[PDB]
Every structure is written in C-alpha cells, then in structure tokens.
Write an enzyme that holds these catalytic residues in place. Sequence first.
Site, PDB file in Angstrom:
ATOM      1  N   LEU A  98       2.181   5.005   0.911  1.00 51.44           N
ATOM      2  CA  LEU A  98       2.053   6.080   1.907  1.00 51.44           C
ATOM      3  C   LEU A  98       2.729   7.280   1.265  1.00 51.44           C
ATOM      4  CD1 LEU A  98       1.610   3.539   3.882  1.00 51.44           C
ATOM      5  CD2 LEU A  98       1.657   5.421   5.547  1.00 51.44           C
ATOM      6  N   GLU A 135       0.910  -1.132   0.000  1.00 50.72           N
ATOM      7  CA  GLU A 135       0.000   0.000   0.000  1.00 50.72           C
ATOM      8  C   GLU A 135       0.964   1.200   0.000  1.00 50.72           C
ATOM      9  OE1 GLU A 135      -1.882   1.214   3.635  1.00 50.72           O
ATOM     10  OE2 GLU A 135      -0.606  -0.095   4.820  1.00 50.72           O
ATOM     11  N   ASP A 138      16.083  -3.541  10.527  1.00 49.94           N
ATOM     12  CA  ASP A 138      16.758  -2.396   9.912  1.00 49.94           C
ATOM     13  C   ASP A 138      15.928  -1.142   9.915  1.00 49.94           C
ATOM     14  OD1 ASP A 138      18.961  -1.125   8.651  1.00 49.94           O
ATOM     15  OD2 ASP A 138      18.186  -1.538   6.651  1.00 49.94           O
ATOM     16  N   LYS A 196      14.830   2.551  10.237  1.00 53.87           N
ATOM     17  CA  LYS A 196      15.481   3.826  10.000  1.00 53.87           C
ATOM     18  C   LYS A 196      14.405   4.776   9.524  1.00 53.87           C
ATOM     19  CE  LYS A 196      17.287   1.910   5.640  1.00 53.87           C
ATOM     20  NZ  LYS A 196      18.528   1.266   5.094  1.00 53.87           N
TER      21      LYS A 196
HETATM   22  C1  56Z Z   1      14.298   1.855   1.737  1.00 52.07           C
HETATM   23  O1  56Z Z   1      13.523   0.956   1.089  1.00 52.07           O
HETATM   24  C2  56Z Z   1      12.129   0.945   1.068  1.00 52.07           C
HETATM   25  C3  56Z Z   1      11.385  -0.099   0.315  1.00 52.07           C
HETATM   26  C4  56Z Z   1       9.918  -0.096   0.290  1.00 52.07           C
HETATM   27  C5  56Z Z   1       9.172   0.958   1.025  1.00 52.07           C
HETATM   28  C6  56Z Z   1       7.671   1.033   1.045  1.00 52.07           C
HETATM   29  O2  56Z Z   1       6.923  -0.043   1.369  1.00 52.07           O
HETATM   30  C7  56Z Z   1       6.960   2.331   0.711  1.00 52.07           C
HETATM   31  S1  56Z Z   1       7.792   3.758   0.264  1.00 52.07           S
HETATM   32  C8  56Z Z   1       6.255   4.557   0.122  1.00 52.07           C
HETATM   33  N1  56Z Z   1       6.040   5.871  -0.235  1.00 52.07           N
HETATM   34  C9  56Z Z   1       6.892   6.942  -0.126  1.00 52.07           C
HETATM   35  C10 56Z Z   1       8.299   6.868   0.436  1.00 52.07           C
HETATM   36  C11 56Z Z   1       9.113   8.020   0.528  1.00 52.07           C
HETATM   37  C12 56Z Z   1       8.577   9.308   0.067  1.00 52.07           C
HETATM   38  S2  56Z Z   1       9.471  10.633   0.183  1.00 52.07           S
HETATM   39  N2  56Z Z   1      10.998  10.271   0.127  1.00 52.07           N
HETATM   40  O3  56Z Z   1       9.143  11.240   1.615  1.00 52.07           O
HETATM   41  O4  56Z Z   1       9.085  11.666  -0.993  1.00 52.07           O
HETATM   42  C13 56Z Z   1       7.217   9.396  -0.488  1.00 52.07           C
HETATM   43  C14 56Z Z   1       6.389   8.242  -0.586  1.00 52.07           C
HETATM   44  N3  56Z Z   1       5.208   3.782   0.394  1.00 52.07           N
HETATM   45  C15 56Z Z   1       5.592   2.530   0.724  1.00 52.07           C
HETATM   46  N4  56Z Z   1       4.693   1.573   1.044  1.00 52.07           N
HETATM   47  C16 56Z Z   1       9.938   1.984   1.779  1.00 52.07           C
HETATM   48  C17 56Z Z   1      11.378   1.994   1.810  1.00 52.07           C
END
Ligand code: 56Z
EC number: 2.7.11.22
Length: 277
Positions: free
Chosen positions: A75, A73, A119, A121
């Site tokens: 976020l 999903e 992990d 973070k």
């Molecule tokens: C490090 O490796 C990862 C591998 C997978 C996931 C994961 O499940 C995610 S990331 C995400 N949206 C999202 C993440 C960062 C931003 S940002 N940078 O604030 O503009 C904006 C939207 N939604 C889900 N569900 C997170 C990290």
Amino acid sequence: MENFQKVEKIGEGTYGVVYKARNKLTGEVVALKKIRPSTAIREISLLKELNHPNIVKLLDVIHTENKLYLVFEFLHQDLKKFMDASALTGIPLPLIKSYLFQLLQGLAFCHSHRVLHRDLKPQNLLINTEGAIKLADFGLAVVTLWYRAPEILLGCKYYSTAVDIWSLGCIFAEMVTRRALFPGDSEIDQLFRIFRTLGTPDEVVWPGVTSMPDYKPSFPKWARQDFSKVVPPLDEDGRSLLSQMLHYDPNKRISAKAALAHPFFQDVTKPVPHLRL
Ligand SMILES: COc1ccc(C(=O)c2sc(Nc3ccc(S(N)(=O)=O)cc3)nc2N)cc1
C-alpha cells in the site's frame, strides 16, 4: 532474499524490518517483512486465509536461513504519515468517518474469525489512492504505548477483541483532534493519562478492576473529565460512539459489529483522499 530487490526500508517493528521490494521475477511490488517456532508460523500461515478488503493481504510466508519473511501486498502510505501531512488542515470528517467505518469492518471480520490484532496504531493502518484503509502487521499471541487498552496495562493475561476497539477509539480521537489522545511515555504514565481523562476506574464502572495483577490501591483517584473537552470538534454521535469504544470494562466496550450500526455512520460515504506520494 535473492528473489527480491529491496527498494527501500519502509519501517520496523519489535521483531522485524519491513522493506518495499520488487519481485525480481514477476516485477510485482510488495512489502516484505524480515524476521530474525512452528506453532507461531502455523498461526501465521493461517493469517493467509484472511481475505477482506480492509485487511492487508498476506501473499507468502517463507521460513529459510534462520529468517522468516512475510510478503504482503504493498500500500502506498500509512495513516501516521497521512495525519502528519494533514496536520495544518485536518483530515475532513467524511474521510475520518469512512476510515473508521472501514477499519471497524476489518475488525468485525477478523474478530468473527477469532483473530485479534493487539497492536493497532497509525503506522500499521495503510491507505491507498482509492479511499481504502486496511489493517496491517497483525500481532501474534521505542515501542508506542499510546493505543494500549487499560486491561493490558493492568496486567490482564488474556486479551479480548475489546483491546482492538480501544486502540481504534484512540486513533479515531487523534484523527479528529490532530493530537494523540493518551500520549504516555511509560506504562504507568500511559495508564495515568488514561485515568486523568476518563477517571480512575473503580469497581462500579469496572467490576474486578481492583483485583487485577497490576492494580494498586495506591493509584491516584482522578475524576472523569467532561467528554466535550476531550474531542471538541466531534459531534454528539461521534462522541457517543467514542465513549462506547473507550469504556473501561472490556465487557461493556462496544464490539466492532455493534459499532458499525451506530448512528454516527448513518451518512457514511467513501471520499477520495488527496495523497502526496
Ligand atoms: C510497523 O510495522 C509494519 C510491518 C509491515 C507493514 C505492511 O504490511 C506494509 S507497509 C506498506 N507500505 C507503506 C508503509 C508506510 C509508508 S509511509 N511511511 O507513509 O511512506 C509507505 C508505504 N505496505 C504494507 N503492506 C506495515 C507496518
């Protein structure tokens, strides 16, 4: 994949790339992790039944064409970005407290199901406009070492749920001070920054520590720094909880369940964050 239209690349791990993607069929917006072992995929397939409001939902697992895709999903923002966006003013304490409380609930839940994250973070802590925060990108049985528990750095072969409590404590300190607690740039620098702040561990505070794989009698002997200097803006209940999350001995380190009962959370609420998307 053919069933998905990559919208943008939103991150990467030491095993895969994550994309914001749109289901060309349903139009649903998701986070898609692409990875380039049936035992592991079985461990993964199990994560699918991990349903809790503070754990990112794993929607699908697809093994095809020598690639493993995990569909989650979506976020809208991660905590690292939110902290950077809030660096001039700081995240308000009630929101910090709400986030910590929620993450502890997520950990208490995965830990009771014998699932460790390993992990944690800021980059894998995800938030939404409604004030929720969720655990993402669980780890299976330039990398950041800032949130690594001391027992991992000292070569422990078997991790316990305590490693997640340590990571969350480092993150809690960082939200409060707006500065990483232990910003090591190497495993030994990481280990030594921990020692310089909490004191070089010994058999008194950590029975068995001198017998650990990577422990060296030659480690420097630093005295424990006064905790009031470590996270100054944090009140005493917060400092007390943090000290318990950062105990050297994995067995003395507070559990997520017990942490939820700490006096620090007596006045916990669920504020709405101001998110710039
Ligand atoms: C490090 O490796 C990862 C591998 C997978 C996931 C994961 O499940 C995610 S990331 C995400 N949206 C999202 C993440 C960062 C931003 S940002 N940078 O604030 O503009 C904006 C939207 N939604 C889900 N569900 C997170 C990290």
